Design a protein around this ligand. Structure first.
Ligand SMILES: Nc1ncnc2c1ncn2[C@@H]1O[C@H](COP(=O)(O)OP(=O)(O)OP(=O)(O)O)[C@@H](O)[C@H]1O
Ligand SMILES: [Mg+2]
Lengths: 48, 61, 101, 102, 139, 396
């Protein structure tokens, strides 16, 4: 029973594994211009 | 005092682009007294005897 | 019905005489039975009475006192209630009944 | 009386906070990011309040997200279907073993 | 101040009000009722509201803006499966039907008498019969 | 290819007499588990930032999930909001423009809609639950007999992964798709739980009824997602138990609900043998009735081996008894051969039920050591549901 409870708590301690969200390498980053793109450009609804 | 920066307004930008100013209302006499007439009753009110039939019904209930 | 899903398959057969007498005694505990009502005899008048039919017999015995505005049930109130609940539907045709010798 | 009026005023203040959404947890996504599924809307990768340990955020939970910031702030009891919920006995019957003969 | 607080507490039950179904209770003074708008919200509950009418199907009333449980509405089951309303009485007197004295008495003894005189049923120790089956030739 | 996400099984201890060496092995496993816990907790405690922080401020909270539909420019794209609308969003710099592919789930900024991330591993939680994480504790040694049947299933789901050279040096494509059919209670699901306990590949399990849904598009889409996950996760095994629920014989149905049943079946057929060849994903199907399945579903090419599980033979029943009575405390007078020789159609589940019932009759008589009479009683008190149905004395 100690083995079972220990397995439960140890899998609880590390179950949440990192799921990266597809970030580009830092070399190809333009955060200063990225903020400008965020503030100046606006989302345009696609219509027909 | 008089407020805590609201969550509904903080995310739209508070203390970043615009900041709130404490609100205070200038209410003085000769203005409140005129306003209290919204629901003031009258001299007739306070002397009416209600209705005895429904008064008895309410008392019994 | 394979084992591992159903390990025990318990059968509920129709109660026997010593069992029907028991059913007659648990469904008449609250009933104001008179003196001289032999509950075993009524049980003996119900061969293969399911078990709910015993409760129906008790209820109809009480009903036969309700229509008379009483609180006590006699032996005749049960014997005349057994024939009501434990009613049977016959073939009502000798031609079909003598299909088989 | 002061305790009663204080209770009334705190209830009045707490009643004006907008109701929080409920959503199913697809999976956790960092240490401070949790993927959720708001019922009318779609998926949302939301934050987590400092009062909640992310290890308690299991997949297929029913965490509550704040009205505007969409911040996880409660685990909430797990979701069971309303029709499968009435199938659980809350009032036991009044038939005992002594009432079964034979 | 206490009558004032009770007054604004009553004011929160003003009559802009959406209705939602009380899905489940979490703990004291909160709920998970889903609004009719199309979303389910984790809400707060008024203290004045009694918790025993919060059955897990109740069509409770929610505040329009704060979206909190402010009022429990009485259930709506008046004519779901054609329960006979006060204007749908068959208009058939017992004296209108001819004969059937024994059949009337047996039916009256299981579906009408137990509702009125339950004490007389309980006085003997029998539960009233719950089902009757009228059978015979058509008409 | 994320690799085979095999189930996590703790090492087995194989004294079963409750002796001291069993305790020593269990305590060794406990000590290693405690040491691993010490390592992780002491790593968190002992362990005591400017680049990703700006990124997280740029993304903000919350962070919507949309479906990419068009890459207009290198910095501009069209995404579908999770309700079904469309938006002409902008692509930010930290977004990696290689993983940006049409149809993928993209992250969108809440206030000003714009692609700010790629959500890979967006599997439907109805399918992430299909994966087996804790392996069943039924090894191949827990099955009595079925040596021929075990060998057939071991040459299609384990051998092609341990010794692929045997298959490749000869010119074969290893059997990919077996069906386990037979009377109820013979050891099909037991064999599935046994291969799940020995395989090193991800073992997705389904009752052939989770993959059926009320919505029009959800049914076949779920089986497509299941097979996509199976192919994504390197060598994989898909166990579709009770395949008779979905894969029944096709017919011209006048009911719309049934026409989708055949429609998701026809996607199970496509995902087994279609225009695009399958990956390194084996499929293990189980059913009690093989005469009701569609001929195309059990067609060779989709299902290569039809492993038959007949009712256990005398030797197989004797081995099954010993398997199910290993943990018992049998009396010296318990000769099991008295019960095995009976011509009754005794399945393995029947044997296990006899063992459990025989143990229970020992508790009836205040005994933890079952005798021979307990077995002779449990045989009768358990051999119901089959009564005795046979032709009378016509044949001599
Ligand atoms: N050869 C065998 N050796 C050991 N145990 C067996 C054997 N065959 C069957 N059993 C027992 O039968 C029990 C019934 O489960 P099992 O997985 O065998 O069912 P099944 O044949 O897949 O059933 P169904 O046809 O209802 O899906 C198992 O718990 C197992 O112990
Ligand atoms: Mg099975």
């Amino acid at each position: 029973d100690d083995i079972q409870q220990l397995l439960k708590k140890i899998n609880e301690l590390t179950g949440i594994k990192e799921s990266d969200t597809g970030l580009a390498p830092p070399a190809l980053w333009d955060l200063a211009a990225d903020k400008q793109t965020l503030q100046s450009e606006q989302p345009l609804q696609v219509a027909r | 005092h008089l407020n805590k920066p609201s969550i509904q307004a903080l995310i739209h930008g508070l203390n970043r682009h615009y900041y709130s100013i404490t609100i205070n209302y200038r209410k003085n006499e000769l203005e409140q007294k005129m306003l209290l007439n919204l629901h003031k009753k009258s001299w007739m009110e306070g002397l009416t005897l209600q209705d005895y039939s429904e008064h008895c019904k309410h008392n019994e209930s | 019905l394979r084992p591992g899903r159903i390990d025990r398959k318990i059968e509920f057969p129709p109660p026997n005489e010593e069992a029907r007498l028991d059913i007659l005694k648990i469904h008449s505990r609250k009933m104001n039975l008179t003196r001289g009502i032999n509950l075993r005899k009524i049980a003996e008048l119900m061969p293969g009475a399911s078990g709910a039919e015993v409760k129906g017999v008790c209820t109809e015995a009480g009903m036969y006192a309700l229509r008379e505005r009483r609180v006590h049930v006699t032996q005749e109130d049960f014997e005349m209630a057994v024939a009501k609940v434990m009613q049977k539907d016959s073939e009502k045709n000798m031609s079909i009944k003598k299909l088989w010798k | 009386l002061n305790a009663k009026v204080r209770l009334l005023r705190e209830e009045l203040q707490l009643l004006q906070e907008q109701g929080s959404y409920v959503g199913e947890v697809v999976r956790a996504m960092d240490k401070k990011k949790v993927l959720v599924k708001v019922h009318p809307e779609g998926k949302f990768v939301v934050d987590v309040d400092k009062n909640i340990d992310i290890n308690d955020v299991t997949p297929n939970c029913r965490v509550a997200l704040r009205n505007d910031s969409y911040t996880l702030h409660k685990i909430l009891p797990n979701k069971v279907d309303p029709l499968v919920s009435l199938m659980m006995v809350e009032k036991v019957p009044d038939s005992t073993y002594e009432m079964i003969g034979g | 101040e206490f009558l004032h607080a009770q007054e604004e507490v009553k004011r929160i039950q003003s009559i802009p009000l959406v209705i939602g179904q009380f899905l489940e209770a979490v703990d004291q003074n909160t709920a998970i009722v889903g609004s009719t708008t199309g979303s389910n919200y984790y809400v707060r509950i008024l203290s004045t509201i009694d918790r025993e009418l919060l059955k897990p199907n109740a069509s409770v009333a929610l505040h329009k803006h704060s979206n909190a449980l402010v009022d429990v509405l009485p259930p709506e089951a008046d004519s779901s499966i054609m329960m006979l309303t006060s204007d749908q009485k068959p208009d058939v007197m017992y004296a209108d039907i001819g004969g059937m004295d024994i059949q009337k008495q047996e039916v009256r003894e299981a579906v009408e008498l137990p509702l009125t005189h339950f004490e007389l049923y309980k006085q003997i120790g029998i539960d009233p019969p719950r089902g009757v089956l009228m059978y015979g030739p058509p008409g | 290819t994320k690799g085979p996400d095999a189930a996590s099984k703790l090492p087995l201890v194989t004294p079963h007499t409750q002796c001291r060496l069993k305790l020593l092995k269990l305590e060794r496993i406990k000590d290693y588990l405690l040491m691993e816990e010490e390592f992780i907790r002491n790593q968190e405690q002992m362990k005591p930032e400017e680049e990703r922080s700006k990124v997280d401020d740029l993304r903000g909270t919350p962070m919507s999930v949309g479906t990419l539909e068009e890459i207009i420019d290198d910095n501009h794209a069209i995404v579908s909001t999770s309700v079904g609308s469309e938006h002409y969003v902008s692509i930010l710099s930290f977004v990696d423009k290689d993983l940006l592919e049409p149809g993928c789930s993209v992250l969108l900024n809440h206030k000003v809609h714009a692609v700010i991330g790629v959500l890979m591993d967006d599997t439907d939680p109805l399918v992430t639950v299909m994966k087996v994480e804790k392996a069943p504790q039924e090894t191949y040694a827990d099955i009595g007999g079925l040596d021929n049947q075990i060998q057939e299933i071991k040459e299609s789901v384990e051998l092609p992964l341990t010794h692929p050279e045997y298959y490749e040096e000869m010119g074969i494509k290893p059997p990919k798709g077996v069906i386990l059919y037979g009377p109820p209670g013979t050891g099909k699901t037991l064999l599935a739980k046994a291969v799940a306990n020995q395989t090193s590949a991800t073992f997705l399990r389904v009752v052939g009824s989770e993959l059926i849904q009320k919505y029009l598009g959800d049914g076949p889409k779920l089986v497509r997602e299941l097979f996509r996950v199976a192919e994504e996760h390197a060598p994989s095994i898909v166990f579709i138990d009770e395949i008779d629920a979905i894969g029944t014989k096709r017919y011209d149905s006048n009911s719309g609900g049934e026409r989708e049943i055949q429609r998701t079946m026809l996607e199970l057929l496509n995902q087994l043998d279609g225009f695009d060849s399958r990956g390194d994903v084996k499929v293990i199907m189980a059913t009690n009735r093989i005469e009701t399945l569609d001929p195309a579903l059990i067609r060779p090419g989709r299902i290569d081996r039809k492993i038959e599980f007949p009712l256990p033979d005398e030797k197989t029943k004797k081995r099954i008894f010993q398997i199910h009575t290993s943990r018992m405390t049998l009396a010296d007078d318990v000769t099991l051969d008295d019960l095995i020789m009976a011509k009754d159609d005794l399945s393995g589940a029947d044997i296990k039920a006899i063992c459990t019932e025989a143990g229970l009759m020992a508790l009836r008589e205040r005994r933890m050591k079952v005798t021979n009479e307990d077995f002779k009683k449990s045989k009768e008190n358990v051999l119901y549901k089959k009564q005795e149905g046979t032709p009378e004395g016509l044949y001599l």
